[PDB]
Write a protein that holds these residues in place. Structure first.
Motif, PDB file in Angstrom:
ATOM      1  N   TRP A  19       0.866  -1.209   0.000  1.00  0.00           N
ATOM      2  CA  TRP A  19       0.000   0.000   0.000  1.00  0.00           C
ATOM      3  C   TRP A  19       0.890   1.242   0.000  1.00  0.00           C
ATOM      4  N   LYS A  20       0.645   2.152  -0.943  1.00  0.00           N
ATOM      5  CA  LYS A  20       1.390   3.394  -1.151  1.00  0.00           C
ATOM      6  C   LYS A  20       2.684   3.183  -1.935  1.00  0.00           C
ATOM      7  N   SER A  21       3.043   1.956  -2.310  1.00  0.00           N
ATOM      8  CA  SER A  21       4.256   1.803  -3.125  1.00  0.00           C
ATOM      9  C   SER A  21       3.987   2.388  -4.484  1.00  0.00           C
ATOM     10  N   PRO A  22       4.735   3.427  -4.889  1.00  0.00           N
ATOM     11  CA  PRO A  22       4.349   4.016  -6.172  1.00  0.00           C
ATOM     12  C   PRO A  22       4.455   3.038  -7.331  1.00  0.00           C
ATOM     13  N   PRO A  23       3.597   3.137  -8.323  1.00  0.00           N
ATOM     14  CA  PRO A  23       3.612   2.144  -9.413  1.00  0.00           C
ATOM     15  C   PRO A  23       4.945   2.120 -10.141  1.00  0.00           C
ATOM     16  N   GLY A  24       5.623   3.264 -10.222  1.00  0.00           N
ATOM     17  CA  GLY A  24       6.910   3.311 -10.914  1.00  0.00           C
ATOM     18  C   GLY A  24       8.023   2.732 -10.076  1.00  0.00           C
ATOM     19  N   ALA A  29      10.776  -2.916  -6.304  1.00  0.00           N
ATOM     20  CA  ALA A  29      10.714  -3.292  -4.865  1.00  0.00           C
ATOM     21  C   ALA A  29      10.433  -4.774  -4.686  1.00  0.00           C
ATOM     22  N   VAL A  30       9.477  -5.293  -5.482  1.00  0.00           N
ATOM     23  CA  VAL A  30       9.079  -6.700  -5.371  1.00  0.00           C
ATOM     24  C   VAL A  30      10.181  -7.587  -5.923  1.00  0.00           C
ATOM     25  N   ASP A  42       1.866  -8.784   0.030  1.00  0.00           N
ATOM     26  CA  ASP A  42       0.505  -8.386   0.390  1.00  0.00           C
ATOM     27  C   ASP A  42       0.025  -7.336  -0.600  1.00  0.00           C
ATOM     28  N   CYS A  43      -1.064  -7.567  -1.285  1.00  0.00           N
ATOM     29  CA  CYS A  43      -1.561  -6.718  -2.364  1.00  0.00           C
ATOM     30  C   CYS A  43      -2.991  -6.321  -2.107  1.00  0.00           C
ATOM     31  N   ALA A  44      -3.482  -5.413  -2.952  1.00  0.00           N
ATOM     32  CA  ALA A  44      -4.914  -5.149  -2.983  1.00  0.00           C
ATOM     33  C   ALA A  44      -5.314  -4.373  -4.238  1.00  0.00           C
ATOM     34  N   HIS A  45      -6.474  -4.651  -4.806  1.00  0.00           N
ATOM     35  CA  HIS A  45      -6.923  -3.889  -5.999  1.00  0.00           C
ATOM     36  C   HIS A  45      -6.950  -2.399  -5.726  1.00  0.00           C
ATOM     37  N   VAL A  46      -7.380  -2.026  -4.505  1.00  0.00           N
ATOM     38  CA  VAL A  46      -7.603  -0.621  -4.150  1.00  0.00           C
ATOM     39  C   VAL A  46      -6.238   0.080  -4.125  1.00  0.00           C
ATOM     40  N   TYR A  47      -5.094  -0.631  -4.067  1.00  0.00           N
ATOM     41  CA  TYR A  47      -3.788   0.027  -4.022  1.00  0.00           C
ATOM     42  C   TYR A  47      -3.398   0.495  -5.414  1.00  0.00           C
ATOM     43  N   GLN A  48      -4.053   0.016  -6.468  1.00  0.00           N
ATOM     44  CA  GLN A  48      -3.868   0.544  -7.834  1.00  0.00           C
ATOM     45  C   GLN A  48      -2.478   0.277  -8.397  1.00  0.00           C
ATOM     46  N   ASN A  49      -1.806  -0.774  -7.901  1.00  0.00           N
ATOM     47  CA  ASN A  49      -0.461  -1.117  -8.378  1.00  0.00           C
ATOM     48  C   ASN A  49      -0.264  -2.604  -8.593  1.00  0.00           C
ATOM     49  N   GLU A  50      -1.400  -3.314  -8.615  1.00  0.00           N
ATOM     50  CA  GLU A  50      -1.271  -4.783  -8.799  1.00  0.00           C
ATOM     51  C   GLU A  50      -0.658  -5.096 -10.154  1.00  0.00           C
ATOM     52  N   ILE A 259       3.625  -7.685   7.807  1.00  0.00           N
ATOM     53  CA  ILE A 259       3.824  -7.292   6.401  1.00  0.00           C
ATOM     54  C   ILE A 259       4.321  -5.869   6.247  1.00  0.00           C
ATOM     55  N   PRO A 260       5.563  -5.563   6.700  1.00  0.00           N
ATOM     56  CA  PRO A 260       6.101  -4.199   6.549  1.00  0.00           C
ATOM     57  C   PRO A 260       6.206  -3.789   5.088  1.00  0.00           C
ATOM     58  N   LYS A 261       5.871  -2.524   4.812  1.00  0.00           N
ATOM     59  CA  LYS A 261       6.009  -2.024   3.449  1.00  0.00           C
ATOM     60  C   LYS A 261       7.294  -1.244   3.317  1.00  0.00           C
ATOM     61  N   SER A 262       7.981  -1.422   2.173  1.00  0.00           N
ATOM     62  CA  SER A 262       9.013  -0.505   1.774  1.00  0.00           C
ATOM     63  C   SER A 262       9.200  -0.576   0.261  1.00  0.00           C
ATOM     64  N   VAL A 263       9.593   0.561  -0.301  1.00  0.00           N
ATOM     65  CA  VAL A 263      10.091   0.523  -1.673  1.00  0.00           C
ATOM     66  C   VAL A 263      11.591   0.863  -1.769  1.00  0.00           C
ATOM     67  N   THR A 264      12.235   0.951  -0.597  1.00  0.00           N
ATOM     68  CA  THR A 264      13.657   1.296  -0.509  1.00  0.00           C
ATOM     69  C   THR A 264      14.479   0.016  -0.446  1.00  0.00           C
ATOM     70  N   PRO A 265      15.270  -0.266  -1.475  1.00  0.00           N
ATOM     71  CA  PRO A 265      15.939  -1.592  -1.473  1.00  0.00           C
ATOM     72  C   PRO A 265      16.703  -1.932  -0.235  1.00  0.00           C
TER      73      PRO A 265
END
Ligand code: NAP
Ligand code: 47D
Length: 314
Positions: A19-24, A29-30, A42-50, A259-265
């Protein structure tokens, strides 16, 4: 490293939030997360980045970095799709975006159904969310169908309070019990009562926002900050770990998934390095003592919905 669910499958107790991981940024990150050992996303349709999460999954499958059976991919049914005739399509869109033929776990994202349409949060002219007349029990039956159709291996719930969990458990004709309840949980919202309840029923609890969600868009500069709490820093220092690592290890030792979120490698890698130390029982009790019933995720516009979950005590 995995916990057994009531559907017979094993779930990695550490996953990557999106959640909040920018699409770009979320494809890289994944990919980094899978390269350094994550096996649950952990994903969700509402996050708009699936779609972008799915590009990363598909490339690491194609590259033979991992087999599909070793991955545990979770997504969630958004509130505007609680109607029985909308649940399969909603699941199929997630599947198509993630480039998967099944999910390991699909959750009812919140107990509240909202009016269907293009808008994720349909509001009336005064800002209240517009409910749908669906209830959690018919939505649950629709989720059971997805198991019987092969689209998902497990179904669960999220942001259900204990009376709502009990309502699912007591559903007439219940076919599959929820496997997971994914709820907000961290030292300022320790959830002892709801976790005990769910675990006593064999429902595994997943802790979301375990770092307090510092990037949540409604953060105020004056709000409490787990990552900056000197008491937690001190516990970290004692174990030669970072504060984020202590915050991730804490729910793991309560038999939760986290399920911690990060987009920072670098932080993606740091966050995974939590299997080589143990907090003491005293550390755990001390961390629990910082509970303030402080909730990051509780949107005001939804508080009058009949099924809003956080009026109940737990
Ligand atoms: N079921 C639901 O209703 C629900 C609700 C909320 C969340 N969730 C799930 O839970 C996941 C985690 O919750 P969250 O996204 O609210 O917040 P979180 O995981 O508590 O915090 C993420 C924030 O922490 C930062 N961060 C991560 N690792 C760090 C580290 N080692 N050191 C310092 N800062 C670090 C991240 O920054 P960078 O990304 O910039 O590195 C980001 O700003 C979500 O992404 C979503 O998958 C589910
Ligand atoms: O849903 C997510 O996974 C992440 N997220 C994103 C935006 C946001 O405002 N929230 C807070 C919400 N509170 C309710 C409260 C209720 Cl009853 C229904 C829906 C929500 S959404 C949020 O949690």
């Amino acid at each position: 490293s995995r916990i057994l669910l009531n559907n017979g499958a094993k779930m990695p107790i550490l996953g990557l939030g999106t959640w909040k991981s920018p699409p770009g940024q979320v494809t890289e990150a994944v990919k980094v997360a899978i390269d350094v050992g994550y096996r649950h996303i952990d994903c969700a349709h509402v996050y708009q980045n699936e779609n972008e999460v799915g590009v990363a999954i598909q490339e690491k499958l194609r590259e033979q970095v991992v087999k599909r059976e070793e991955l545990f991919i979770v997504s969630k049914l958004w509130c505007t799709y609680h109607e029985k005739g909308l649940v399969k399509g909603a699941c199929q869109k997630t599947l198509s975006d993630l480039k998967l033929d099944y999910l390991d776990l699909y959750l009812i994202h919140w107990p509240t159904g909202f009016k269907p349409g293009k808008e994720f949060f349909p509001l009336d002219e005064s800002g209240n969310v517009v409910p749908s007349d669906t209830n959690i029990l018919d939505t649950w039956a629709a989720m059971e169908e997805l198991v019987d159709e092969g689209l998902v291996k497990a179904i669960g719930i999220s942001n259900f309070n204990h009376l709502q969990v009990e309502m699912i458990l007591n559903k007439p004709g219940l076919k599959y019990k929820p496997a997971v309840n994914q709820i907000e949980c961290h030292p300022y919202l320790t959830q002892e009562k709801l976790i005990q309840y769910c675990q006593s029923k064999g429902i595994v609890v997943t802790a979301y926002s375990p770092l307090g969600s510092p990037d949540r868009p409604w953060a105020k500069p004056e709000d409490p900050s787990l990552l900056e709490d000197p008491r937690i820093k001190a516990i970290a220092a004692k174990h030669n770990k970072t504060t984020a690592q202590v915050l991730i290890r804490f729910p793991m030792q309560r038999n939760l998934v986290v399920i911690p979120k990060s987009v920072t490698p670098e932080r993606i890698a740091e966050n995974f390095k939590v299997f080589d130390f143990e907090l003491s029982s005293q550390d755990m009790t001390t961390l629990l003592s910082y509970n303030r019933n402080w909730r990051v995720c509780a949107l005001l516009s939804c508080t009058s919905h009949k099924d809003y979950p956080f009026h109940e005590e737990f």
